[PDB]
């Protein structure tokens, strides 16, 4: 309540809503903490840090805006609630429960409010298409991110990417993290989902400089300390935005993680810069403060400014698969990469099989067609049937692995990388056989 | 018609390559039958009898494989096809080592280097393979070193004019001619889903069904040579006969190019045409009688099926005998020697 009063001090129109909003926040937080516990999923940890992140998100969304209606404040409240609570959830019923209760808590504490105006099914926020972090519709976001993916094909990696709904949602989540104060992300999910790809794509898209640790045979803690020195020197002194991406190839060493937690929490690593290193850090911090326009002279104030710059400049992106301390879970904003849904598989198939012919004008739609994509157009075309069959093949591998596990045999995981491999193989084989027959003809 | 059929054929073949490979022979066949049933249910045209080995390979490559140490089995031919048309670096799970020797023989001209994960000099060799562009076969993958994750995932960063890959603490210049074959000799091994995503599995393990099929094929080859020849003709009719027919067509066109006076010097050139026609008729006959020969070979195979099941059961009892006592170590080659003794040099059969 004190924090919300300080936050809503900017917009006087929402001051009388400081007391109710806080209550709503608290209630929802409590509800989630009762509903989701670490016994189900190890990352279902809730603490006052999530509430501080909620307040910080609402503060960052409200700071540049001159005025808001009450519906806008409730909408950003719901947006931050979704980004902090629903994102970590693994199963679908949990996400549905969270989405329903957000509305209940909002209305319960905010009566006489236009629910439609304050609550649309695709609650969406981004300042990519404007100057301020305003709500934005789904279609223009999809168009803008498709254009930026087309750009990202030339610069950096050349392998194609498909922008389906889950990918775009995760892109928006990672962008929100990259625009938060000390916003650190933990992409937890299945292998091959696209965690590294999307993290790097959003980091490039927002201009962040991707830095990754290169551990080796007997990696020394002194080497990790030097890497941290370089990263914080660039983030704080040089005013450079850095996406500090870490993967399980080096996250598995918890000795570095427990030292990373200090930077994740406070935004500084005391004892990292000492002696000569501390003197050079103070010199460069003085130079940077003068360049920005601050004549801070005392070493303590310079260190405070450096810590603030690291808070506002350095973002750490952890990438892991479903050991890790709950403190690390609670320091980072949790995002879940599930296995690609049927719609995602269908979209990937249609995009990656678009250069193929896959068009029979005399194709006959079979009565009671076996359909795996519910939203598949009826009546389907030949290409639609082919992509449906591809999705069915992936689903049959999943069912086969489930049956083998039930019988007691050893099974391997079918990641979305298997589906991408299958579609690439289909393209190569189709083109090869067509070329062979055409030259024969 | 083959234009009409290629879409379904390639869908099934690509699914087989990408998805099958860890499963046993019956499980691959069940997956293929499920996919074929779905494609038929949706009116997606495909050939009813997809011979995967002959669709995804030609006689020249199969003969070259047989020149190498690739056993002439359906499972091994399918596994070699996966080892050929792979987009992800394969993980070989042979318990015997024939597949590793096959890989070494295939890439001997490319200077393939055999390394192990247990070797302390592994990483260094890997760096060389990444930098100088040489095939590398890394064994003992059950102790997989996660440092290979960027290499298997092909995560490259194109800084400057040099393409890099992060191996350990060092950024190695990836070479276009690099290929790595992971391998293991442990059939009962579990891999993390990360590695499962970065590699394609190629299982050479001999199971009950694989050995049953081997024994059935050997019975057919030994005691019913005519039925074995007819079955081989079915497999060859999936393109090999047409391949040689079109090769003779090309030869006839080449001979018909040189036509100036010598076309009617004897006016008996028609012989070559007759030859093609004859073979055409032959293959046409083999096309027309395909269903009858399929029924015949299936009945003859059902005749010797119980013997094949008996052979599989006998071998697996022999293999399991090691639990009774440590001396009871009997290899598959030992059972095959027993079985060839029973088949060929059996004085009772005289």
């Amino acid at each position: 309540g004190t924090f919300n009063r300080a936050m809503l001090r900017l917009v006087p129109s929402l001051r009388t809503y400081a007391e109710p909003l806080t209550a709503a926040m608290v209630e929802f937080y409590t509800m989630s903490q009762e509903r989701f516990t670490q016994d189900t999923q190890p990352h279902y940890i809730y603490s006052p840090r999530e509430m501080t992140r909620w307040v910080r998100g609402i503060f960052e969304a409200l700071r540049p805006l001159e005025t808001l209606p009450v519906e806008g404040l409730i909408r950003i409240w719901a947006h931050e609630a979704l980004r902090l609570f629903q994102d970590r959830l693994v199963e679908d019923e949990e996400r549905r429960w969270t989405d329903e209760n957000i509305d209940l808590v909002a209305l319960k504490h905010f009566p006489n409010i236009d629910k439609e105006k304050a609550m649309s099914r695709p609650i969406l926020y981004s300042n990519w298409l404007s100057k301020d972090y305003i709500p934005v519709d789904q279609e223009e976001l999809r168009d803008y991110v498709k254009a930026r993916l087309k750009v990202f094909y030339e610069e950096e990696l050349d392998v194609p990417l498909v922008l389906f709904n889950e990918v775009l949602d995760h892109v928006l989540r990672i962008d929100r993290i990259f625009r938060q104060p000390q916003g650190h992300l933990l992409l937890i999910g299945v292998s091959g989902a696209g965690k590294t790809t999307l993290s790097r794509f959003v980091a490039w898209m927002n201009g962040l400089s991707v830095y990754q640790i290169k551990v080796h045979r007997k990696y020394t803690g002194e080497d990790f300390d030097e890497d941290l020195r370089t990263v914080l020197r660039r983030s704080g002194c040089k005013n450079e935005k850095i996406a500090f991406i870490m993967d399980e190839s080096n996250v598995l060493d918890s000795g570095f993680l427990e030292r990373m937690n200090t930077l994740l929490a406070n935004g500084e690593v005391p004892g990292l810069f000492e002696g000569d290193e501390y003197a050079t850090l103070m010199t460069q911090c003085k130079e940077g403060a003068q360049k920005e326009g601050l004549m801070l002279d005392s070493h303590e104030e310079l260190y405070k400014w450096f810590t603030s710059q690291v808070i506002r400049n350095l973002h750490v992106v952890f990438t892991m698969n479903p050991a890790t301390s709950p403190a690390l879970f609670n320091r980072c904003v949790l995002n879940w990469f599930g296995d690609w849904s049927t719609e995602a598989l269908y979209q990937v198939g249609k995009e990656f099989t678009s250069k193929m012919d896959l068009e029979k004008p005399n194709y006959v739609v079979p009565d009671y067609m076996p359909v795996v994509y519910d939203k598949l157009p009826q009546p389907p075309s030949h290409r639609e049937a082919i992509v449906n069959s591809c999705v069915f093949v992936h689903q049959t591998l999943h069912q086969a692995n489930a049956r083998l596990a039930k019988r007691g045999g050893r099974t391997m995981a079918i990641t979305p990388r298997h589906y991408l491999d299958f579609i690439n193989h289909y393209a190569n084989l189709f083109h090869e056989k067509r070329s062979e027959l055409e030259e024969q003809q | 018609n083959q234009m009409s059929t290629i879409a379904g054929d390639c869908l099934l073949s690509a699914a087989f390559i990408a998805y099958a490979g860890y499963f046993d022979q019956q499980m691959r066949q069940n997956l293929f039958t499920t996919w074929s049933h779905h494609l038929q249910q949706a009116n997606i045209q495909f050939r009813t009898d997809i011979a995967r080995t002959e669709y995804l390979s030609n006689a020249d490559e199969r003969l070259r494989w047989q020149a190498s140490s690739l056993p002439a089995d359906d499972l091994c031919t399918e596994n070699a096809i996966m080892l050929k048309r792979f987009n992800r670096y394969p993980l070989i799970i042979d318990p015997s080592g024939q597949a590793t020797e096959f890989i070494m023989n295939e890439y001997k001209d490319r200077k393939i280097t055999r390394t192990s994960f247990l070797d302390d000099a592994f990483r260094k060799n890997l760096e060389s393979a990444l930098r100088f562009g040489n095939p590398l076969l890394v064994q003992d993958v059950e102790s997989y070193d996660p440092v290979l994750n960027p290499v298997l995932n092909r995560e490259v960063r194109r800084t400057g004019g040099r393409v890099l890959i992060t191996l350990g603490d060092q950024d190695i210049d990836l070479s276009p001619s690099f290929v790595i074959f992971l391998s293991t000799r442990d059939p009962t091994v579990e891999f993390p889903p990360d590695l499962c995503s970065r590699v394609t599995f190629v299982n050479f393990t001999v199971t009950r069904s694989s050995l049953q099929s081997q024994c059935l094929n050997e019975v057919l080859k030994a005691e019913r040579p005519d039925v074995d020849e007819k079955r081989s003709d079915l497999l060859k009719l999936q393109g090999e006969f047409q391949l040689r027919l079109r090769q003779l067509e090309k030869s006839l066109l080449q001979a018909l190019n040189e036509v100036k006076g010598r076309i009617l010097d004897d006016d008996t050139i028609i012989t070559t045409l007759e030859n093609l026609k004859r073979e055409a008729a032959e293959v046409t006959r083999k096309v027309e009688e395909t269903d009858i020969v399929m029924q015949e070979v299936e009945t003859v195979s059902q005749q010797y099926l119980p013997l094949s099941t008996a052979c599989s059961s006998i071998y697996f009892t022999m293999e399991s005998l090691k639990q009774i006592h440590f001396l009871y170590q009997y290899s598959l080659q030992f059972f095959l020697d027993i079985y060839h003794n029973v088949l060929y040099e059996n004085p009772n059969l005289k």
Binding site: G408 | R208, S313, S320
Partner: peptide, 29 residues
Amino acid sequence: MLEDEDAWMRTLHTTASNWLHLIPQTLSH
């Protein structure tokens, strides 16, 4: 098991259920 792999699960389930039935649940100190 290793001699013939395919029945074993149901038999083991029944055997373990019977064993749980015979073996007393708790022993008092």
